[PDB]
């Protein structure tokens, strides 16, 4: 070994104190040390003061939920939100990300995840989220969200108007059981 | 009955509704003011050319205020009445309850044009005897509510050589606010400068009013930066 | 009332519904992981299994592209990582800018694999900073989630700032290593360039600032996360978003 060229940083050497230390042990020790120090310095060692979120990661900043769109009639009810896009060609359609944020709602949930994730995982592969396309705003589109504040009972129904004064259901999305989301694409 | 009075300069245009009785005087004032402006350029690029509609109205308002102040108004006060109408419209259309300093922060152009708008506004208020109403800024209200903690600081000479032009700008922009104070101060400082223990320091005098009125009579920087003068 | 009063201007903890606690920083929000990363280093992070083991341990690591001499070897390694890591986990690749011959085939290769759905989310450019045009090309064409730069000088830090300014909606990770780091390094002091440039760095909201100077424990890295490291130099605290 004395013949070989081994890379090493002069300051990091003093921390390399064990041969074949598992990568997880090294990094867990560092991260848990940071957690312990922050708990002491910012939370008085009280874990109840640490804010809780459904899941961690995603966007650097959460999008502000824009609730006012020109040409969209929105109605809120205890068990039901309805969103109706104008059929008038002179009115612009809502921007896609703002529209999907309004449908997702402010709370990180399966509904938020379904509409706001940029990718869906197929096996180990990344696929651009097709939900963003099928839920994209269209003229005369009508969206109904049942139980919008109860994720276990939340149902999203999307309706289109292929013929004057007749709505047809074209998408139904709901949670089945604890973790399975079923999205039904409906042919009329 | 109200008649339109259109004020136009190059690409800048606005219209006022003036009573038929005042329309003659308002037309005269407008024509004379337009004749006092430089010829309009495509980009409003001259320093003495207005760069925005609020600025054009402010300069017109300041022009009328000067006519009233110099005594060119008729025995009926027709100019003062036109000025009151234009000032009310300026506040309604452009200030919208805010202060003139807030408006000029959003206007285009060099600082001299912004100062012209401020000057014209306060001149118009002075000429119409329109006292300043107590109206706190957002910052003072935040301080009063305990949201903001304001401190204040005062300077020395430091690396500054142009402090007298700052005084000249103040005197030109806020004559109705600082005129008394500057005059009384100039008198005081001249008396002090004439004291037998101090006179030998003032080889070029301490005639602040003469220097303010006549820029060419201002002493050179070396004398202005002398402690007996600068302090 | 709403807009006139202008006020002049650190790590936190967050608990998930699963009970897991994370150190909350710009880096950890972006990655969905603790703000600790293993740097792309040849040959140590060339092996695909070491990269997979670190990712399985729950941390970020860069695959060192400098050890791959052809597209087949690199594709095989990335495919092995893809199958060995938890579903969803994104791969970050470290490339060496001073090797234009390698870059010429590595960049199109990464774009192709990403288009094929391989979970490549990050690119780290080491040994130099590209021009704004070249950086913009990588940002716009490769479909990445973040790009990372290892600047070696104050001017290189300024170049990264210019790239971030040109792409205000895109996450840019600035990995600052200085002369204390192992391997190829600069002659620069670790603290002085950051002290000089920190305000300019923090003016770009999309920059994630990562410290990399021969660290090895919690105690030597904690002052950098909290920003306490700058107080010994007479400066206000200057937090880092993570450590490498």
UniProtKB/TrEMBL annotation, chain A:
Span of the entire protein shown here: 1062 to 1249 of 2122
Superkingdom to which the source organism belongs: Eukaryota
Name the record gives this protein: Fatty acid synthase subunit beta
Subunit field text: [Alpha(6)beta(6)] hexamers of two multifunctional subunits (alpha and beta).
Organism field: Chaetomium thermophilum (strain DSM 1495 / CBS 144.50 / IMI 039719) (Thermochaetoides thermophila)
Function text: Fatty acid synthetase catalyzes the formation of long-chain fatty acids from acetyl-CoA, malonyl-CoA and NADPH. The beta subunit contains domains for: [acyl-carrier-protein] acetyltransferase and malonyltransferase, S-acyl fatty acid synthase thioesterase, enoyl-[acyl-carrier-protein] reductase, and 3-hydroxypalmitoyl-[acyl-carrier-protein] dehydratase.
Record family assignment: Belongs to the fungal fatty acid synthetase subunit beta family.
């Amino acid at each position: 070994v004395g013949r070989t060229c081994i890379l090493q940083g002069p300051m990091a050497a003093k921390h390399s104190t064990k041969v074949d230390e598992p990568i997880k042990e090294i990094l867990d020790g560092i991260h848990n040390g940071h957690i312990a120090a922050l708990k002491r310095d910012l939370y008085d060692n009280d874990e109840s003061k640490i804010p809780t979120i459904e899941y961690f990661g995603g966007k650097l900043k959460d999008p502000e939920v824009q609730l006012d769109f020109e040409g969209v009639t929105i109605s809120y009810d205890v068990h039901k939100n309805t969103y109706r896009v104008s059929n008038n060609p002179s009115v612009p359609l809502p921007p896609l990300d703002a529209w999907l944020s309004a449908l997702a709602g402010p709370n990180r949930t399966w509904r938020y995840a379904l509409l706001q994730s940029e990718v869906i995982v197929q096996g180990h592969k990344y696929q651009t989220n097709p939900m963003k396309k099928i839920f994209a705003p269209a003229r005369g589109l009508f969206v109904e969200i049942q139980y919008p504040n109860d994720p276990a009972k939340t149902v999203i129904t999307v309706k289109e108007q292929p013929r004057p004064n007749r709505y047809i259901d074209v998408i139904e999305a709901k949670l089945v059981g604890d973790k399975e989301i079923v999205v039904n694409l409906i042919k009329d | 009955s109200l008649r339109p009075l259109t004020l136009s300069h190059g690409s800048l245009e606005t219209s006022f509704l003036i009573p038929t009785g005042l329309h003659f005087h308002a037309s005269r004032l407008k024509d004379e003011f337009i004749a006092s402006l430089p010829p309009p350029t495509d980009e409003l690029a001259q320093d003495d050319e207005p760069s925005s509609v609020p600025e054009l109205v402010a300069r017109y308002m300041g022009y009328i205020a000067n006519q009233v102040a110099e005594g060119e108004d008729d025995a009926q006060g027709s100019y003062e009445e036109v000025l009151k109408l234009i000032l009310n419209e300026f506040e309604r259309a452009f200030l919208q309850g805010n202060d003139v300093h807030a408006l000029v922060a959003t206007l285009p152009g060099i600082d001299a044009k912004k100062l012209e708008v401020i000057r014209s506004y306060f001149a118009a208020r002075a000429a119409t005897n329109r006292a300043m109403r107590a109206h706190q800024s957002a910052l003072l209200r935040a301080a009063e509510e305990g949201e903001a903690r304001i401190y204040s600081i005062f300077g020395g000479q430091g690396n500054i050589e142009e402090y007298f032009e700052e005084l000249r700008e103040l005197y030109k922009t806020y004559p109705s606010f600082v005129g008394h104070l500057i005059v009384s101060s100039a008198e005081l400082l001249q008396i002090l400068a004439s004291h037998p223990s101090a006179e030998k320091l003032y080889s070029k005098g301490l005639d602040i009013m003469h220097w303010l009125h006549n820029p060419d009579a201002t002493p050179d920087t070396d004398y202005l930066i002398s402690a007996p003068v600068s302090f | 009332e709403e807009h006139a009063v202008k006020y002049a201007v650190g790590p936190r903890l967050i608990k998930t519904s699963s009970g897991r606690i994370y150190v909350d920083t710009k880096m950890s929000r972006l990655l969905g992981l603790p703000p600790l990363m293993v740097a792309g280093m040849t040959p140590t992070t060339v092996p695909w299994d070491f990269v997979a083991a670190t990712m399985n341990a729950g941390y970020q690591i860069e695959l060192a592209g400098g050890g791959y001499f052809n597209a087949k070897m690199m594709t095989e390694a990335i495919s092995k990582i893809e199958r060995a890591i938890p579903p969803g986990r994104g791969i970050t690749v470290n490339l060496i800018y001073v090797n234009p011959h390698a870059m010429a085939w590595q960049i199109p290769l990464l774009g192709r694999l990403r288009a094929e759905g391989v979970p490549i989310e990050g690119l780290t450019i080491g040994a130099g900073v590209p021009s704004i045009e070249v950086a913009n090309e990588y940002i716009q064409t490769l479909g990445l989630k973040h790009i990372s730069f290892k600047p070696g000088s104050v001017d290189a830090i300024q170049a990264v700032i210019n790239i971030a300014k040109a792409n205000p909606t895109f996450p840019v990770i600035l990995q600052w290593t200085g002369g204390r780091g192992g391997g190829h390094h600069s002659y620069e002091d670790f603290h002085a360039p950051i002290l000089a440039m920190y305000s300019r760095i923090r003016r770009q909201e999309n920059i994630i600032l990562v410290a990399g100077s021969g660290f090895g424990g919690a105690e030597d890295t904690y002052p950098y996360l909290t920003g306490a490291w700058s107080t010994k130099y007479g400066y206000p605290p200057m937090p880092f978003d993570g450590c490498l």
